[PDB]
């Protein structure tokens, strides 16, 4: 008779989502991971749950304790693990708890910046054990309690979305039959960018410049109209260089980038209009 | 005894963080190495999963796990979880997560329209091809939905090679023991030029086009003073460009366009002077 897969119950605590790198399509997540399963019963001092911390956890693994490696699928490099703890129950129960900080990757489309929406995901999967050996029974997510989002870069929208799926790998389908599927937890945090800084400091002043760019037609002579249009051209270049110094690095154009091109277009159109009157 | 045939599978999750001046790029993925070792006893005489720090305990106890070096890696790669799958019939399956900075010859002279070949070179660190040879290489790359949102555009399937590297410093040390088995993996990609087309080539074009409109001015005093203003604008655009564009020891298409902008103004200035005095 075959032994049943080990049901693992996971809880994820998300303390912080920050340090978004637009070009690399990465974000930093600080939190805690809690994993619970029923192992083999054991003797604990006084028949009370035993606490095993950090470097002592290894001593238990060398001695035969089963602690499966759970991998963050979308982590970029090894996550910085803080303190870690095992809570060993005499009835077999095991509770693993560790603090983490890692750079996570996901598909990030910033074409609508500063009015872009993002989905921050965390993907967890056993590194070596298939779903015939280890399966995720459930997932709970606890996120930060925010007082005021005004002071925050991102605005979290709704509760955390979770999924428990099975990943079938075609490579290792040959390794063994029905042993190629892995249990996977997916956690998703939806957020909208705070556009307050870009509204007042990028869209509004650029608007006042594009509005003032058409006022050159109210000049008396052709010599005055033209020389002022080149001054506005220099201002749009100076504003483009001001935006570049702040705006994130991207392989495409944002709403703000399109407004700068519109500013160049407006001046080049105004210049073509001044020439189409004199000669 | 016959060399040990090693079968390799490489999973490329991400290629990012290109450093133009250092000629490096970051690769996140998995490395799967498979060979047949000596038969052994495992619990319940079933495959055995040995993870991370436990691997070290098996090596100390006599298990042969050869070190496979990434030839073009820059510094020690960040190795995540590592695993060994041990079979009673001798088979060993080594799987590990890695993140590394890889160096390659990168020519950015055609930027932003440059094409790159991202390579990964794998070779045993200590065992020559009489002891250890690569029998095959499989490459699995990311399934892309939309490349519009990506900096690089992958073109074609991964190209693989298995070659032998002969080292001269190993001759006069031992005969026919100086050759090493090497896996080469190549990913071809074309840069997404959308940002540089609309934000660099197009506005610079509108400036170089507007630079010749100075000849339509009535007096010599107007024609000259406006040419110096355009000169200041090309310097202004060159300092706008410099702040964004990657650091290189040569000139790109954009850099040549800026020099063309300087040339066009200096030509226009020589033309204005060749009319008055």
């Amino acid at each position, epitope marked *: 008779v075959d032994a049943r897969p080990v049901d693992v119950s996971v809880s994820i605590f998300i303390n912080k989502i920050y340090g978004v790198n637009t070009l690399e399509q990465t974000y930093k997540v600080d939190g805690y991971i809690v994993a619970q399963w029923t192992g083999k019963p054991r003797k604990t001092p006084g028949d009370k749950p035993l606490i095993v911390e950090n470097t002592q956890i290894e001593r238990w693994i060398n001695n035969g304790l089963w602690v499966p490696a759970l991998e963050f699928i979308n982590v970029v490099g090894s996550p910085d693990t803080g303190n870690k703890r095992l809570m060993l129950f005499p009835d077999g129960r095991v509770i693993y708890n560790a603090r983490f900080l890692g750079s996570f990757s*996901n*598909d*990030m*489309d910033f074409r609508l910046f500063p009015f872009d929406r*993002q*989905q921050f*995901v965390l993907e967890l999967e056993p590194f070596s054990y298939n779903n015939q050996q280890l399966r995720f029974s459930d997932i709970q997510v606890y996120t930060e309690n925010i007082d005021n989002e005004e002071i925050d870069e991102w605005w979290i929208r709704g509760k955390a*979305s979770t*999924h*428990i*799926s*099975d*990943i*079938r*790998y*075609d*490579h290792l389908s040959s390794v063994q039959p*029905n042993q190629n*599927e892995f249990s*996977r937890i*997916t956690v*998703r945090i939806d957020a909208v960018r705070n556009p307050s800084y870009y509204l007042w400091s990028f869209i509004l002043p650029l608007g006042l410049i594009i509005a003032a760019s058409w006022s050159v037609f109210w000049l008396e002579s052709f010599s005055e109209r033209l020389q002022t249009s080149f001054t506005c051209m220099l201002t749009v270049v100076a504003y483009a260089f001001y935006t570049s110094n702040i705006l994130p690095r991207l392989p495409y154009t944002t709403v703000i980038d399109q407004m700068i091109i519109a500013g160049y277009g407006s001046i080049f159109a105004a210049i073509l209009l001044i020439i189409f009157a004199h000669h | 005894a016959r060399p040990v045939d090693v079968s390799v599978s490489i*999973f*490329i*999750n991400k290629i990012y963080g290109v450093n133009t001046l250092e000629q490096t790029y970051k690769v996140d993925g998995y490395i799967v190495a498979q060979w047949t070792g000596k038969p052994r006893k495992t619990p319940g005489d079933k495959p055995l999963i040995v993870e991370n720090t436990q691997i070290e305990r098996w090596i100390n106890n006599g298990l042969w796990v050869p070190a496979l070096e990434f030839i073009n890696v820059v510094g020690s790669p960040d190795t995540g979880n590592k695993r060994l799958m041990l079979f009673p019939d001798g088979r060993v399956i080594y799987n590990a997560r890695f993140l590394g900075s890889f160096s390659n010859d990168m020519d950015f002279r055609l930027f932003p329209f440059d094409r790159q070949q991202f390579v990964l070179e794998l070779e045993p660190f200590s065992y020559n091809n009489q002891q250890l040879r690569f029998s095959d290489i499989q490459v*699995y*790359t*990311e*399934n*892309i*939905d*939309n490349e519009e949102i990506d900096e690089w555009w992958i073109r074609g399937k991964a190209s693989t090679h298995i070659s032998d590297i002969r080292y001269d410093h190993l001759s006069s040390v031992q005969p026919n023991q100086n050759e090493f088995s090497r896996i080469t993996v190549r990913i071809d990609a074309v840069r997404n030029p959308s940002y540089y087309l609309w934000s660099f080539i197009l506005p610079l074009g509108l400036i170089i086009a507007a630079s010749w409109s100075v000849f339509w001015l009535e007096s010599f005093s107007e024609r000259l003073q406006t040419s110096f203003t355009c000169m200041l604008t090309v310097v202004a655009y060159a300092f706008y460009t410099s702040n964004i564009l990657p650091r290189l020891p040569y000139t790109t298409v954009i850099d040549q366009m800026i020099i063309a902008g300087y040339g066009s103004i200096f030509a226009a200035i020589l033309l204005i002077i060749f009319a008055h005095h």
Partner: nanobody
Amino acid sequence: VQLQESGGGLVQAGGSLRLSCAASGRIFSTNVMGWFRQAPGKEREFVATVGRIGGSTVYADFVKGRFTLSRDNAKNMVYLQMNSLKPEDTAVYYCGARIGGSDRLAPENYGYWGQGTQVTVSS
């Protein structure tokens, strides 16, 4: 782009069906395609889609090795081979294209939905 499902019908418990999805329009890969299902008075739930790396496929927790997603990139088609069908699998099977987002499992990130193919598992 337009999506069109076929292959559904009446099957006995333990039986098999092979669903097919045809795409026509602005589509360069069958990877963006995903299977979903919707039983009367129940939410549209994820069934199967391609995984992020080559050789991987994402299946819902109820699939339990019974269904298989295959593709014919030349014919611009995805197929869902359904085996060991239980009456719980009775629903209208939809084929949607990942309209964006960054979650393969969420139906919100899918669009251009087909009319659907009715699958009825009896007892």
